[PDB]
Design a protein around this ligand. Sequence first.
Ligand SMILES: *[C@@H]1O[C@H](CO)[C@@H](O[C@@H]2O[C@H](CO)[C@@H](O)[C@H](O)[C@H]2NC(C)=O)[C@H](O)[C@H]1NC(C)=O
Ligand SMILES: *[C@@H]1O[C@H](CO)[C@@H](O[C@@H]2O[C@H](CO)[C@@H](O)[C@H](O)[C@H]2NC(C)=O)[C@H](O)[C@H]1NC(C)=O
Ligand SMILES: *[C@@H]1O[C@H](CO)[C@@H](O[C@@H]2O[C@H](CO)[C@@H](O)[C@H](O)[C@H]2NC(C)=O)[C@H](O)[C@H]1NC(C)=O
Ligand SMILES: *[C@@H]1O[C@H](CO)[C@@H](O)[C@H](O)[C@H]1NC(C)=O
Ligand SMILES: [Ca+2]
Length: 641
Amino acid sequence: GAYVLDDSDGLGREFDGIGAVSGGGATSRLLVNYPEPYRSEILDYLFKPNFGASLHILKVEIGGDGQTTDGTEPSHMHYELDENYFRGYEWWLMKEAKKRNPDIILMGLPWSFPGWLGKGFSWPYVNLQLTAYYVVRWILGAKHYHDLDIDYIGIWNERPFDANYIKELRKMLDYQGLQRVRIIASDNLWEPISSSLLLDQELWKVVDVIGAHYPGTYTVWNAKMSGKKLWSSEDFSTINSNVGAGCWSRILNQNYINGNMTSTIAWNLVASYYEELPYGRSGLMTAQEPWSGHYVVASPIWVSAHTTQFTQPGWYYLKTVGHLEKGGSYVALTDGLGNLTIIIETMSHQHSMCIRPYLPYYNVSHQLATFTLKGSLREIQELQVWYTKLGQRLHFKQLDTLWLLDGSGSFTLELEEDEIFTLTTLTTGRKGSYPPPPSSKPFPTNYKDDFNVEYPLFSEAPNFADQTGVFEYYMNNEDREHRFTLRQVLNQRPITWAADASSTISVIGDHHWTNMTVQCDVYIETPRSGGVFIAGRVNKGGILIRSATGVFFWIFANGSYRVTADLGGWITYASGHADVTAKRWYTLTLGIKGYFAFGMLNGTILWKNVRVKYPGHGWAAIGTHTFEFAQFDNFRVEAAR
Ligand SMILES: *[C@@H]1O[C@H](CO)[C@@H](O[C@@H]2O[C@H](CO)[C@@H](O)[C@H](O)[C@H]2NC(C)=O)[C@H](O)[C@H]1NC(C)=O
Ligand SMILES: *[C@@H]1O[C@H](CO)[C@@H](O[C@@H]2O[C@H](CO)[C@@H](O)[C@H](O)[C@H]2NC(C)=O)[C@H](O)[C@H]1NC(C)=O
Ligand SMILES: *[C@@H]1O[C@H](CO)[C@@H](O[C@@H]2O[C@H](CO)[C@@H](O)[C@H](O)[C@H]2NC(C)=O)[C@H](O)[C@H]1NC(C)=O
Ligand SMILES: *[C@@H]1O[C@H](CO)[C@@H](O)[C@H](O)[C@H]1NC(C)=O
Ligand SMILES: [Ca+2]
């Protein structure tokens, strides 16, 4: 009936911000080669204040060279003694975010780790000091090379924590003058971190924030008891259609109302990875075509705005927040300077389903809601109104100011289903706009890369999405014809998060491709035992990369070749002998059309008219038999979709 908003009785919890995750894994892969001005426009829609999603927080993966959901991300230490703070794109992304918003909050979290940290086991807790040293080097590098202050560091994404590790990490941060960096744990479930904090005073002293994943809007009694800030440190992960925006809208309010969570962070920031990879199109917006420049400013962007443009980290929730009588919810926040923001959501069940968890049905229906401002809020006489309707839709439209001149400090709204209203004293709101970008276009049906770039802007060639292993630009001064190549640089399996393949692989192109010719120069670095391949019709990647099928043309340094149906090499289409050895350059060609494939070695037919499964479709790919050095040059693909 009448909902009282008031601060006379005091405040609720401090609001810590809304944000998103870039990483876990390679979710921002295709954004780096967007041409201008589009790359810059996309970044403005995400980070520019008073414009688009206007995010308060950016969480990034600390790449560990393993597969982490939609690809691998490169580490700053591939090997013992190796340090390089210029790989991948997270450094770049953080800098672009800070340029737009100097106050944005930065977080880092490992999903996987380089294998050498395990000292012969696939476990990062064998040598606590060693793993801590690795993580802290990342934070130092961020500051020293990019002028980035990392605000929060996590433990091990969705994997067990070790209490002694957390203590050693704190001691190691302090020893290196990073007393200011805070620790969030354990990026998994509420337990066992929450009970652990209550039983161990020394642990409690070193953990600043309990971050839970996909909590379904709820927390647990032990977490409330700890008195720690509680964050949904990973949530969302739904296709960014109107339904995903509904999900986002609902949890943004209800994480606080139901779960005392004062921050929510969406996986992921922007869908810049091939859509046929796991959880495709699950970013706040979509930017998956750097070749065309086409991007889509999706609904979730504006749902974010309804909160982020009108609140900042450090505002407070009022004690008076709740559910509306006929379904939906409201929160309200102040900054202790006389501003007030109120956010109302009426998302219907059927249009707000998240993947984790699925909620039993609940009812929403038309209702009137009356709000009365008591206490220090009584003196407000004017509120700006912003409105979104989801599903033919209207996004972030500024309505007529509402006036509370009558002296009643009260007002009423007609609420229907699937709406959001933001009512705020702030006058800074803006529906940012750039002109439409170029239309959508398939990946180019003819495509070439000779990797001849002397000072590349990024450490890897555009469009190649590593799914196991790490491929990088490589300069070899001691050769002329292959001075500039692409090289696979892992020499041992990472401490994996996902089930990485046993073979390294990078995919590229159009998952729809069905008939195609792939050609590449290849170079095996390991005598006797080394091997490389080129492939087409590769149908799965990311978390599922082990499952990839397609047509794989392998050559080995012992003078053999195989053609397989799967990355695992369990199904043979053909095999035989070849004039192939280590440390020599060969040109491989692979032609697939309908039921039949053929392979060429240096332009000469090696096998032809081999029967392959059809129909079938997928990416082109290159890679290596195991985690071993190998080089690639002059890649070409001609394909029909
Ligand atoms: C966490 O939030 C809950 C509500 O989600 C608060 O628990 C009580 O909630 C009921 C019903 O909504 C209110 O009537 C009470 O006023 C709340 N209890 C208290 C402590 O006043 C609870 O306050 C929050 N817990 C915290 C902040 O630790
Ligand atoms: C509402 O919020 C605005 C923005 O923070 C406040 O205006 C700022 O107030 C601070 C200190 O109070 C000043 O130093 C800044 O110059 C102001 N900035 C802007 C954007 O004007 C304002 O005081 C708050 N109160 C209301 C109701 O406007
Ligand atoms: C890929 O190649 C196959 C085989 O050539 C194509 O399928 C043939 O298409 C022709 C003309 O449309 C038909 O008359 C044949 O009967 C088809 N062969 C088989 C075995 O299906 C297929 O259409 C090509 N796909 C694309 C998109 O280029
Ligand atoms: C939802 O609630 C409204 C209002 O009470 C009611 O008329 C409608 O039938 C309900 N729908 C379901 C399926 O519960
Ligand atoms: Ca080259």
